[PDB]
Amino acid sequence: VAAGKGEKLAAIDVQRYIQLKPPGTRESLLQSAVVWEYQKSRNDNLYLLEKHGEKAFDSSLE
């Protein structure tokens, strides 16, 4: 990977999970299902973050 990215050559990975492909083949179903699961996990994580607030941030600054 070093001989590769010695000329920057930023490695690429799929970020096309926000395009929200319209009704099509099974790929549309897969994207919708994975986006739903990502959304549920995001809900859980952010509500968990706001359960305690920024006390952890205050401790980090201290």
Binding site: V14, Q15, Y17, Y38, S41, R42, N45, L46, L49, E54, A56, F57, S59, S60
Partner: peptide, 12 residues
């Protein structure tokens, strides 16, 4: 303590 950034909630 490990405070999470604005956007780190699983996901890509």
């Amino acid at each position: 303590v490990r405070p999470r950034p604005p956007s780190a909630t699983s996901l890509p």
